[PDB]
Structure 1
Amino acid sequence: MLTAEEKAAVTAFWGKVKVDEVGGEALGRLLVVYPWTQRFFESFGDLSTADAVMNNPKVKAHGKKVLDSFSNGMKHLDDLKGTFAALSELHCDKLHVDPENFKLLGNVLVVVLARNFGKEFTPVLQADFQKVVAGVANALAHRYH
C-alpha cells in the first residue's frame, strides 16, 4: 500500500474534499461516461441524458454514500480488504457488478478530484490516489480472487 509520507499527504489532501459534491459528480460521471453502469441503477429514474443523470436526485444521494465509504477507507488504508468486506459481498453476491467497473469508478473519482482541485491535484498526489483507488477496487473484488 502506502508509505508514511504518502499516507500523510493523501490524508491532508482528503480534508479539502467536499465529500458529498464529489460523490455525486463521480457517480454521475460513471453513468454518463460508461453508460452500461446505468443498468444497475434502473430504479433511479430518468437517465436518458447527461444532464438528467447528473441532476438525478438518487444518483446524487447515492454518490454521497459511495464517497462516505471511500472516506472510511481513507481512515483504514492499512486494511482496505477488511474495511470493504461487507461491500465486496454486496456488489458480488447480490449485485453481480463486474470488478472492472470498480476500477472505472476509481479512475472517474481521480478525474473528478483533478477537475475540482486543478493543479493542486499534483502528479505525485494523483499517483498516491491511483494506489488508493486500485487498493479499494481490489478490496471490492476480493470475492472473485
Structure 2
Amino acid sequence: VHLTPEEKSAVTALWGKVNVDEVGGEALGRLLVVYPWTQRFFESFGDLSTPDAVMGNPKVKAHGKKVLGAFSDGLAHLDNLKGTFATLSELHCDKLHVDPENFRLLGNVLVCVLAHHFGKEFTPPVQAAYQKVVAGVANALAHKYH
C-alpha cells in the first residue's frame, strides 16, 4: 500500500484514538450480524442468535481484539503487508477456505465502525486513506488465492 506521508499521518493519528479493547469486537460483531453466513466460521463461539447476543458475546469481543491487532500490525508496516499477513493468509485461505470477498466486507465494516465512532472527524479524505489500508489488508490476507 502506497500512502502519502499526509495520508499515513491522518490514518495513524485516528488509529491512536481507536479503543484497542472494543473496536475490533464491534467490527467482527457487525460482520456476523450484517453478513450472517460468516457465522458459519464461528460455531465454537457460542451464542450468535440475535444482534444483542453477538455484540455481547465475550468470545466475539476477544477475537475482535486479535483482528484489530492484525490491522494495527498492518499499519505498522504498510510496505510489507504480504509478509506481515503470510501466516494469517495460510490460515484463512488454505485451512479455513474463507471466500476472499468476505475480507473486503470486514474491512468495510471496520470503516463503518470508525465513521460511527468519530463522526465528522472521519472526513472523506480520511476514509479514502483508510480504504487504501483495508484493501491492502484484504489483498494480503487473500495472497494464497492469488
2:64 is matched with 63
Tell me which residue corresponds to 1:116. 117
What is the count of residue pairs matched by the alignment? 145
Q: Which runs of 4+ in 1 moved over 4 A?
A: none
Alignment of 1:12-91 (within 5 A): 12-91=13-92
5+ residue gaps, structure 1: none
Residue 133 of structure 1 aligns with which residue?
134
**Which TM-score applies when normalising by structure 1?**
0.98
Q: Render the CA deviation track for 1:10-41: whole Å, top value 9, x for unaligned.
A: 11111111122100100000000000000000
**Counterpart Cα distance in 2 of 1:124 and 1:19:** 23
User: Percent of counterpart pairs with the same letter?
Assistant: 84
Within 1, Cα distance between the matches of 2:144 and 2:83? Answer: 12
Matched residues in 2 for 1:13 and 1:7: separation? 10
Over the aligned positions, Cα root-mean-square deviation in angstroms equals: 0.7
Q: 1:49 and 1:117 mapped to 2: Cα distance?
A: 26
- Equivalent residue number for residue 11 of structure 2: 10
Cα deviations by residue, 1:58-100 (Å, 9 ceiling, x for unpaired): 0110000000111111100111111111100110111110100
Task: Provide the C-alpha distance between the structure 1 equivalents of 2:29 and 2:88, rounded to a whole number of angstroms.
Answer: 20
Give 1:4 deviation, angstroms.
1.6
